[PDB]
Design a protein around this nucleic acid. Structure first.
Lengths: 122, 502, 23, 529, 344
DNA sequence: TAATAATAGTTTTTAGTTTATTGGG
DNA sequence: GCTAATAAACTAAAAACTATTATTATG
């Protein structure tokens, strides 16, 4: 939650996402309470600012896809607002959601994918 | 600065809102039409810097970027404009509704998941700093999704997701003869016991036109009051009351209506060549001698102290004359941005001065090259109403002390008394005319009439609304309640031949 | 929320001007 | 109209000297007369001013018939002042060596007034004299002088180097001169002048004798040469069957400079050679010029702008029907707080003069409203083109007259709402007991009110409302410096201006220790400017 | 007027720098229109929008008399703007872009105007003296340095005072961060040194400044600072020919000693320029040094590589200077040039 | 090789004008 | 019976308020 320099919360997201990927080395689940804690921390004072929020969410989904379902609409809601690499960042948040194949076509076309894909950002 | 407010209006395109059990009353469609007209007029007056949209569901046709059937966006999220008002008014009335039904469908099925999707997309289109996301639905039936259990399930799932995403859904009761039937399908689905055969929940205020600028919260200046020279405390200065003035006009062309800019030039006379500020010399002629000076000395002669406050001392509230008023007062609040910990000391000093009933007199410097006046800081204890909402902010009232040369001399007036029975007559007259005054009771009729004319000409009305002036005394009622008392006191004081008018 | 304007969130509900009564 | 004012300054040597660390009474008197004359000139008053000097080395007056009114040199006769007068006061006025009776100077000055009040009229005849009372005087013409003043109605005000009734602050609070150092000549002169003006005026005689330093922060010097405020001839109305003629006055009114800064050339120093124009050219099309009247005002309307001429509004304006003052109702005085007193001036209203019935009615109203703790709601209209406004009328009774005070009141449009946090409920900002006690001690050491001995009355150590605004003083100081020295930098703010600006140093000495307590007990951190 | 205005104006600037003297002659009327538009009382144009001065700073045209008449008006406007901006008495030292713009216009205008022939020459010069901290960028100090370097000849007979203070402030400016500031300070310093050397050469009071300002620093010097002193000694060897000429070659002699330490790596061009100057002032040369200087210069030519382009240019300039110096002595000319080309 | 830091862009007064308009003589 | 300011409305103008964005730092 300490957003003063990027390394602080960046490395915090790094370690916590690694933990959530390798908690009990994916052999047991009772630390889901900690997943709720980190999700709340995301909700607490970060959805009101939503710039470091997307960064930490991106990293943790790079380390743990199944959490991002808690913010699908959220990560969709924030999509058109950004215009720089932030957009880019949110993009790979979608990449981790192979489990998100419920429906994305209507989302992306409503999110107006065609402009960002048409734009030349390799 | 903080976020803005986003409003979404979603009316059902069906048969229910175009019909009523009593056609003498307004159809739900049409009454919603005047409702949106009134709210858009109020928004234009107050906060035209926000986003408003119009969209319908249940229509036979559809039009939306999401391309959902029976979902037709009528207006995108935008600042209100007279074009929107007329675009809505052309469908107003028991003939505008027939037109709407003519070139626009209505009555088909729909999906609340679909409308939630399209409204979420529309809100997502806004890239500005938002704070409020209010969605107003317009239907009088909780059944249409109770018919299909899966439809209700997905609708309430999406509604929960939307309300968790900061979206606020509020319910507009609509006149259902069988009852709006709340608590059956809505309070479990809306973001928040009479079944509401009627519609009026707060539609009375929605239809009520409001004329107020309602400027958002802002800081006039964060001055930094010095105690002696170094123990200095950051404070915030606001004006909870501030004169509302007519916005300035807009110079435009009388043949294209576009605003024409103006450029202003200082130049020669003998030659007429364009000149520079260096060529400009301040002059002042006293008697027969002209003194020449420049601007910089003019503001430096107004520059004595740094922008801030310099305490003069402490004085009981009784030592100030009630008629001693110069300029409308200000409000002072503790500030912890520059000086941290000043809130504790502000609380301590407020408590101590409230106990000691002494106000703090200070030397005030608003900005650079500004005159330091004398300001009295009266304690202002917080007051809560019945619902415990702050009706009096906690802090200080900063009033201004006029100088000796800020007061004018008058011809001397003698003292002439009156009989106590005349005083009793005055008391009886006052009691016959007594009431309780509140600050929210009287407006500026001149401004209200100017407004009404402005919207009337914007709407191209044949006639403007007449402003109701509450500053006009009802002479007939006052005379009815007084009767004898007036001429009784007249005969008591004024001679029968000597009327007040010579 | 009670005592708040549904027209404008964050603002108190507005009531029509009461004029004057007599006691 | 016009005031026949003359100044009689002693050019004696006695006040040419002073205690070290205290400016000469001659010098302080020169400062006071310079500020008086700078106000006179820079206000461009139409009041003739004359200067008579007694105690001069020479003698120059029409009454010098040999051993009569000697050491009296008349410097200036009765005419309007000028910058030449200022420069003569600054330079031509020098400390002399002779002394003379001030009664002789009074007789000479009054004779000059009589010889020069002719040929015109005067709203007032006035004179001030600066003296230290250390010069011997012959108490012989006191009765004749008093009778002549009564028969010709000339007002007087006197000022002294020492206080009338340790630290020394010229033009500021604190003792001006100890009262134990006055010579017996000064004491006898003080008694003589006390009885003279007590007989001349009555009991308020002691109110016109003052000190220089206290007069530097007060309008007592100008208190007898001012102009009354014009009335507002109108009629209050109650219903359709009661109306009383009124004469309102702006008791409190913000002051502004009456001389704007004219712009002239940098070479010829002429406004004529430097005149003005404005240009309305199209924002596009290579700045094509829109004709001056072709522009028409419009107005912002939400997201749109509508063309809208002034003629349209003036024919659809909500007209105000003339000048009227209609009462709208009555409410309790407790229903109003000081934060709702709007407007930039205070109308201390009055009824029509010489209307005893109106006076009786207004007194009855004042009594009824005061006994009931009650106030009135009234509507104001200056004239047809004015903007109607609402205001509050509350009683105000003086020892010699009752009155009603009008202050304009706001509408809902003027109201704003800003939410706050309950500091009294702030758990993170609860003051400690030691901090509270230190704050209380500082307040005791800082208060400018002392409970008067043997009485319940309360005194003020800083009478702000009797001090003028110091923009004009420094303004005129720099103006005269530039006029006399248009080659030199502006003179800084004079020390007496700080003396009136600063509170008494005794309160500061009391607060010395509790201020240290506060700064030690509060961990206040700052930020970069 | 926004960032697009910024970029359009800089585009116009770089256009005049690139395109100039071919057909860009439709600008005098544009110049007058720009003068009028800046003279507009409406000072909405931000400090960033002040690059208009760089706009008005013009060198692409022959500048007919119209711009000549406007020049004095511009100059007094700059004096007023500088007086307004610098004074911290008004608590407004804000000159984020204005002062640099005035620098640019003065640089582009003084190339053909206002030499040392009148009083206001020192007046604007005074505005240069006031040149503490510039927020990690240091735009305007470097600007003043460049402006002085361009027209140091326009400030003569009035820069002689404060000589030690100017010298030390130049030293500190070239001894700071922002290497661009350092090189601008070096350019201004060398221009100042050239001007003062010329003045004291033509001054009959050269002894005064010599004993007051030059010998002190010259002996007190002993990084490029040493090479800066090498320039100083080489240029001040000139005036010593006027007074105590017998010492001149004497310093030249010890200069030889210096390159003895050098013989057994950027100070050599300074050595070459200094010896070129002294030989220009010298008349009789120790012939024992001729093979010595031959060996030194050919070793310098051998040491030409290992160099960045900048001091390659510096060293070639110094080589040209030494050739010009040796050009004064016919037999020395021919034999030295033959030997140097052979060995090289 | 990639992070921070003054920094200009919309509101809002407010000092100096500009309007004729009542008030008289 | 001989003309007379005046506050309102109108400007300019100046400051405070969020809101960003080169810039070294390091390599």
């Amino acid at each position: 939650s300490f957003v003063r320099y990027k390394e602080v919360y960046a490395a915090a997201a790094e370690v916590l996402g690694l933990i959530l990927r390798y908690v009990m080395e994916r052999k047991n689940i009772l630390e889901e309470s900690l997943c709720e804690l980190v999700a709340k921390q995301l909700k607490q004072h970060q959805n009101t600012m939503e710039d470091k929020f997307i960064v930490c969410l991106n990293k943790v989904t790079k380390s743990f896809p199944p959490l991002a379902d808690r913010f699908m609409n959220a990560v969709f809601f924030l999509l058109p607002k950004f215009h720089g690499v932030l957009k880019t960042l949110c993009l790979e948040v979608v990449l981790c959601r192979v489990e998100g194949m419920t429906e994305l076509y209507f989302q992306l076309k409503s999110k107006d994918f065609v402009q960002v894909m048409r734009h030349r950002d390799d | 600065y903080s976020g803005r407010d986003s409003l979404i209006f979603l009316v059902d395109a069906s048969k229910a809102m175009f019909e009523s059990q009593s056609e003498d009353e307004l159809t739900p469609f049409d009454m919603s039409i005047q409702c949106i007209q009134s709210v858009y007029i109020s928004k234009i007056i107050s906060s035209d810097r926000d986003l408003l949209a119009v969209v319908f569901y249940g229509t036979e046709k559809d039009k939306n970027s999401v391309n959902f059937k029976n979902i037709y966006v009528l207006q995108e999220l935008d600042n209100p404009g007279a074009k929107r008002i007329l675009e809505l008014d052309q469908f107003k009335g028991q003939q505008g509704q027939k037109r709407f039904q003519d070139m626009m469908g209505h009555g088909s099925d729909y999906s609340l998941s679909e409308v939630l999707w399209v409204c979420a997309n529309l809100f997502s289109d806004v890239q500005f700093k938002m704070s409020h996301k209010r969605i107003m639905l317009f239907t009088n039936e909780d059944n249409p999704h109770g018919n299909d259990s899966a439809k209700a399930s997905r609708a309430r799932t999406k509604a929960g997701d939307l309300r968790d995403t900061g979206i606020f859904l509020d319910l507009m009761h609509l006149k259902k003869p069988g009852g709006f039937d709340i608590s059956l399908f809505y309070r479990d689905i809306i973001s928040i016991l009479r079944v509401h055969f009627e519609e009026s929940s707060k539609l009375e205020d929605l239809l009520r036109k409001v004329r107020a600028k309602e400027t958002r919260k802002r800081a006039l200046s964060r001055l930094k009051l010095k105690l002696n020279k170094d123990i200095v405390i950051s404070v915030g200065i606001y004006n909870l009351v501030q004169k509302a003035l007519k916005p300035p006009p807009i110079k435009l062309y009388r043949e294209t209506n576009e605003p024409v800019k103006t450029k202003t030039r200082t130049f020669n006379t003998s030659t007429g060549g364009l000149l520079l500020p260096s060529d400009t010399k301040r002059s002042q002629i006293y008697g027969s001698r002209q003194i020449i000076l420049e601007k910089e000395e003019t503001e430096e002669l107004k520059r004595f102290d740094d922008p801030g406050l310099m305490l003069m001392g402490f004085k009981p509230l009784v030592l100030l004359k009630k008629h001693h008023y110069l300029r409308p007062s200000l409000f002072v609040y503790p500030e912890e941005s520059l000086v941290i910990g000043s809130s504790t000391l502000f609380s301590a000093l407020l408590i101590k001065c409230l106990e000691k009933e002494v106000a703090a007199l200070c030397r005030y410097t608003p900005r650079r090259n500004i005159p330091p006046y004398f300001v009295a800081l009266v304690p202002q204890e917080e007051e809560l109403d019945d619902q415990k909402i702050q009706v009096t902010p906690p802090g200080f009232q900063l009033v201004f002390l006029p100088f000796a040369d800020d007061k004018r001399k008058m011809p001397f007036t003698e003292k002439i008394m009156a009989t106590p029975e005349q005083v009793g007559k005055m008391k009886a007259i006052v009691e016959k005319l007594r009431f309780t005054y509140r600050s929210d009771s009287f407006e500026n009729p001149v401004l209200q009439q100017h407004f009404r004319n402005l919207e009337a000409l914007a709407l191209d009305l044949m006639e403007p609304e007449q402003a109701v002036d509450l500053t006009l005394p009802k002479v007939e009622a006052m005379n009815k309640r007084l009767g004898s008392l007036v001429d009784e006191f007249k005969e008591l004081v004024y001679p029968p031949d000597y009327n007040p008018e010579g | 929320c009670p005592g708040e304007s549904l027209i404008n969130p964050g603002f108190k509900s507005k009531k029509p001007a009461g004029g004057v009564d007599f006691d | 109209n016009k005031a026949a004012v003359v100044l009689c300054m002693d050019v004696g040597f006695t006040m040419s000297n002073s205690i070290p660390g205290i400016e000469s009474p001659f010098e302080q008197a020169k400062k006071v007369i310079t500020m008086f004359v700078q106000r006179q000139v820079f206000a461009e008053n139409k009041d003739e001013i004359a200067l008579v000097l007694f105690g001069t080395d020479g003698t120059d007056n029409p009454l010098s018939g040999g051993d009569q009114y000697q050491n009296i040199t008349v410097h200036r006769h009765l005419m309007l002042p000028d910058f030449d007068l200022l420069e003569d006061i600054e330079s031509k006025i020098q400390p002399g060596s002779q002394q003379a009776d001030f009664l002789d100077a009074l007789i000479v000055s009054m004779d000059v007034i009589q010889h020069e009040t002719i040929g015109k009229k005067f709203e007032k005849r006035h004179i001030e004299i600066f003296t230290d009372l250390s010069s011997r005087f012959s108490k012989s013409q006191l009765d004749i002088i008093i009778h002549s003043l009564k028969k010709c109605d000339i007002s007087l005000q006197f000022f002294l180097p020492f206080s009338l009734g340790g630290p020394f602050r010229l033009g500021g609070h604190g003792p001006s001169f100890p009262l134990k150092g006055i010579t017996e000549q000064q004491k006898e002169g003080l008694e003589i002048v006390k009885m003279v003006m007590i007989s001349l005026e009555g009991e308020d005689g002691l109110d016109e004798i003052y000190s220089f330093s206290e007069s530097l922060r007060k309008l007592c010097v100008f208190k007898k040469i001012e102009r009354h405020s014009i009335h507002w001839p109108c009629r209050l109305t109650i219903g359709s069957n009661l109306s009383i003629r009124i004469a309102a006055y702006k008791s409190i009114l913000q002051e502004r400079v009456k001389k704007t800064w004219t712009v002239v050339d940098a070479k010829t120093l002429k406004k004529e050679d430097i005149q003005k124009e404005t240009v309305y050219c199209l924002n596009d099309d290579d700045e094509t010029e829109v004709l001056k009247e072709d522009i028409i005002q419009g107005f912002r309307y939400g997201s749109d702008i509508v063309p809208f001429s002034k003629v349209d509004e003036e024919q659809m304006k909500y007209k105000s029907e003339g000048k009227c003052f209609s009462v709208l109702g009555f409410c309790k005085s407790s229903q109003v707080q000081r934060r709702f007193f709007m407007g930039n001036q205070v109308l201390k209203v009055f009824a029509a003069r010489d209307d005893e019935a109106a006076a009786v009615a207004l007194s009855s109203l004042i009594h009824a409203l005061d006994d009931l703790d009650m106030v009135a709601i009234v509507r104001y209209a200056y004239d047809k083109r004015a903007n109607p406004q609402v205001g509050v009328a509350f009683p105000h009774i003086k020892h010699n007259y009752e009155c009603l005070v009008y202050v304009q009141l706001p509408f809902m449009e003027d109201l704003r709402q800003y939410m706050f946090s309950s500091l009294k409920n702030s758990k993170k900002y609860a003051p400690t007991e030691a901090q509270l006690n230190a704050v209380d001690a500082l307040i005791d050491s800082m208060s400018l009110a002392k409970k008067d001995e043997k009485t319940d009355t309360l005194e003020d150590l800083f009478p702000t409302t009797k001090i003028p605004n110091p923009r004009f003083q420094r303004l005129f100081q720099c103006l005269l410096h530039r006029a006399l020295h248009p080659r030199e930098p502006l003179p800084p703010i004079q020390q007496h201006i700080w003396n009136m600006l600063n509170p008494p140093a005794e309160v500061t000495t009391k607060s010395q220790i509790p201020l240290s307590k506060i700064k030690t007990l509060f961990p206040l951190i700052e930020a970069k400017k | 007027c926004k960032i697009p205005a910024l970029d359009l104006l800089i585009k116009l600037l770089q256009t005049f720098r690139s395109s100039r003297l071919m057909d860009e002659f439709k600008i005098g009327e544009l110049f007058s229109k720009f003068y009028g538009e800046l003279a507009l009382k409406k000072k909405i144009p931000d400090t960033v929008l002040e690059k208009v001065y760089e706009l008005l700073g013009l060198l692409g045209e022959v500048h007919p008399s119209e711009m000549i008449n406007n020049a004095e008006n511009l100059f007094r406007a700059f004096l007023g703007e500088l007086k307004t901006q610098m004074t911290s008495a008004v608590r407004e030292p804000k000159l984020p872009v204005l002062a640099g713009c005035l620098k640019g216009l003065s640089s582009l205008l003084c190339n053909f105007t206002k030499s040392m022939e009148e009083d206001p020459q020192t007046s604007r010069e005074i505005f240069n003296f006031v040149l503490q901290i510039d927020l990690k960028r240091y735009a305007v100090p470097s600007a003043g340095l460049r402006l002085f370097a361009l027209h140091a000849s326009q400030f003569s007979t009035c820069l002689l005072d404060n000589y030690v203070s100017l010298f030390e402030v130049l030293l500190k400016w070239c001894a700071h961060t922002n290497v661009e500031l350092k090189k601008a300070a070096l350019s201004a310093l060398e221009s100042f040194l050239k001007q003062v050397s010329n003045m004291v050469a033509k001054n009959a009071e050269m002894h005064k400044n010599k004993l007051q300002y030059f010998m002190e620093q010259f002996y007190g010097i002993i990084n490029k600072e040493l090479s800066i002193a090498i320039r100083g000694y080489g240029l001040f060897a000139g005036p010593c020919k006027v007074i105590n000429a017998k010492d001149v070659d004497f310093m030249y002699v010890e200069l030889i000693q210096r390159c003895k330490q050098m013989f057994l790596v950027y100070q050599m061009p300074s050595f070459l320029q200094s010896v070129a100057s002294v030989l220009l002032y010298l008349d009789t040369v120790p012939e024992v040094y001729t093979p010595v200087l031959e060996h030194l210069v050919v070793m310098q030519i051998d040491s030409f590589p290992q160099y960045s382009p900048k001091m390659q240019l510096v060293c070639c300039r110094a080589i040209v200077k030494v050739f010009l110096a040796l050009a004064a002595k016919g037999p020395v000319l021919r034999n030295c040039i033959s030997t140097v080309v052979h060995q090289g």
